Design goal:
monomer, Structural Genomics Hypothetical 15.5 Kd Protein In mrcA-pckA Intergenic Region, Chain A, Immunoglobulin-like, 3 domains, 3 helices, binds lutetium (III) ion, toxin, beta-hairpin, monomeric
Length: 247
């Protein structure tokens, strides 16, 4: 998904920064410690209200770029009993009979995401992955969370079996389980401005209010989104009729 929202003061740590470190950068740039600083609709320290950044139209945004997916090796659980039934022959004559054996399996699709430094995005992230075995999976997800959705597969199989004279005979419904997954990542980028108000006129021309691009006052202006999309499903259903065993 293409996300673009305001950067907040409580997310400065996500850019390895702080209001104090931003203020100190403004101090270095202009040669006087500002009274206060401003970001979008917020201020910090001894600041002019309303924020000079909104007054003067200088905003600052965090962005999620294009999500890139990388397939992980698929893990296959090669045998799982979904159903098991035993036919008992208590007579002196064999009989043959057609039975139906039924199992159900609950498929899961799981999304998880995070950022390396703890950005606080509000807009849902769109995650879509087509899995070979599991098929198409999509999510609209809050970054930094986990979600699982479920779907039910019921499988019935008819089978004709002869059970000898004094014996029982077991029938199983079996499947393989595929855990399919892909890792994903997206660049986080910050662009726009911070504001500062000074106790005296500073800078070229002598002004009380100044704006500097985020890159001038923050220790970094990028980060990273990461996550995984998993699907667990059953496939390769088989009927197993085991040899008749004596009672
Ligand atoms: Lu194959
Ligand atoms: Lu196959």
């Amino acid at each position: 998904d293409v996300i673009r929202e305001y950067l907040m003061f409580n997310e400065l740590s996500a850019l390895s920064s702080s209001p104090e470190s931003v203020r100190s950068r403004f101090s270095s740039i202009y040669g006087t410690n500002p009274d206060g600083i401003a970001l979008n609709n917020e201020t910090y320290f001894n600041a002019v209200k309303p924020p000079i950044t909104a007054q003067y139209g200088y905003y600052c945004y965090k962005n999620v770029g294009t999500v890139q997916y990388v397939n992980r090796p698929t893990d296959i659980n090669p045998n799982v009993i979904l159903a098991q039934d035993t036919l008992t022959n208590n007579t002196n004559e064999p009989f043959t009979t057609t039975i139906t054996i039924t199992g159900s399996f609950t498929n899961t699709s799981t999304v998880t995401s995070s950022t390396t430094t703890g950005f606080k995005f509000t807009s849902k992230l769109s995650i879509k992955k087509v899995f070979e075995i599991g098929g198409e999976v999509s999510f609209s997800t809050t970054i930094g969370t986990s979600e699982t959705t479920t779907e039910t597969i019921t499988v019935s199989k008819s089978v004709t079996v002869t059970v000898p004279a004094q014996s029982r005979r077991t029938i199983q419904l079996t499947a393989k389980i595929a855990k399919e997954s892909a890792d994903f990542s997206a660049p986080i980028t910050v662009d726009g401005y911070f504001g500062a108000n000074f106790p005296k006129r500073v800078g070229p021309g002598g002004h009380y209010f100044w704006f500097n691009p985020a890159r001038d006052v923050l220790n970094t202006t990028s980060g990273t989104l990461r996550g995984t999309v998993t699907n667990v499903s059953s496939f390769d259903f088989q009927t197993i009729v085991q040899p008749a065993r004596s009672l």
